[PDB]
Amino acid sequence: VEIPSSFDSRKKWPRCKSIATIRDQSRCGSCWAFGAVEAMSDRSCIQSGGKQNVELSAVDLLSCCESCGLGCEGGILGPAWDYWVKEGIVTGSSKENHAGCEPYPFPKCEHHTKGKYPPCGSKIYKTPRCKQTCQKKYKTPYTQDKHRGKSSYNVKNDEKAIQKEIMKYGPVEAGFTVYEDFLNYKSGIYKHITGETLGGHAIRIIGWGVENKAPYWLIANSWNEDWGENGYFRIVRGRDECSIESEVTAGRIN
Numbered sequence: 001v002e003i004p005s006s007f008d009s010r011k012k013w014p015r016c017k018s019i020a021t022i023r024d025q026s027r028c029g030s031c032w033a034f035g036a037v038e039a040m041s042d043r044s045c046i047q048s049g050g051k052q053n054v055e056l057s058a059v060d061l062l063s064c065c066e067s068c069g070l071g072c073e074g075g076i077l078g079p080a081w082d083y084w085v086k087e088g089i090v091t092g093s094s095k096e097n098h099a100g101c102e103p104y105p106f107p108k109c110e111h112h113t114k115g116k117y118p119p120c121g122s123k124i125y126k127t128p129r130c131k132q133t134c135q136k137k138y139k140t141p142y143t144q145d146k147h148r149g150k151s152s153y154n155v156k157n158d159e160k161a162i163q164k165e166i167m168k169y170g171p172v173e174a175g176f177t178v179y180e181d182f183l184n185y186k187s188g189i190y191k192h193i194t195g196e197t198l199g200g201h202a203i204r205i206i207g208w209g210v211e212n213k214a215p216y217w218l219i220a221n222s223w224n225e226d227w228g229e230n231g232y233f234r235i236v237r238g239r240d241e242c243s244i245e246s247e248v249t250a251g252r253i254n
């Protein structure tokens, strides 16, 4: 099929409320789990024609997936998607909304940027326990609130393949390398210019575009709406900038 010059999942599937929802991972290294549950929420809705229209629980995945790494100390994408396929993930909103089976336990904070939330600072919460219990007001038992995928996979390090995957099946999770200058991002199309590595980060790629001839990916971060472009950023597309085309993972419900 023909790939359009720009694509935005928010515009293609606006009935799916997760797609335009920016989350905050708080003072926990759970980016891996956020990019996962965000894209899983999106795809559950997209691929079911809107029948599933839920916010999947970051804390269920973060706390209960044993094979996914080190919890609030960082994690691994492939096993996060395997967990969704095999065990599934329950529902759960942000702390402040406290909806669904297992809402997130940690409050919004600023991630190296200015705004209306307390600064995140440098300290990290301990990984929450795997409690397997919906909040008192939610009247579905934990195991019966699970949402499962059918398959999970890595996407080829090929720009066109990634575009086709997003436009047919919905937003994807992706890893990339964080350099110090990324923490100064306010707006625009990011590329690494200054600073040393801070390791990686995991995010949700929702589309692409071009401005002033410069191609980009359009990405949701998990650092709240004050960060970047109302929670989003753009990064150079087509040159594997910061490995953005090389660590893409997603999955399907059918």
Ligand SMILES: *C(=N)N(C)N(C)C(=O)[C@H](CC(C)C)NC(=O)NCc1ccccc1
Pocket (backbone or CB within 6 Å): 025, 028, 029, 030, 031, 032, 069, 070, 072, 073, 074, 075, 076, 077, 174, 175, 176, 199, 200, 201, 202
């Ligand atoms: C996100 N909030 N965090 C802490 N990250 C960057 C991660 O979870 C990453 C995700 C990948 C880049 C996709 N994984 C890790 O940080 N894993 C733990 C780790 C890895 C190497 C050395 C120490 C710890």
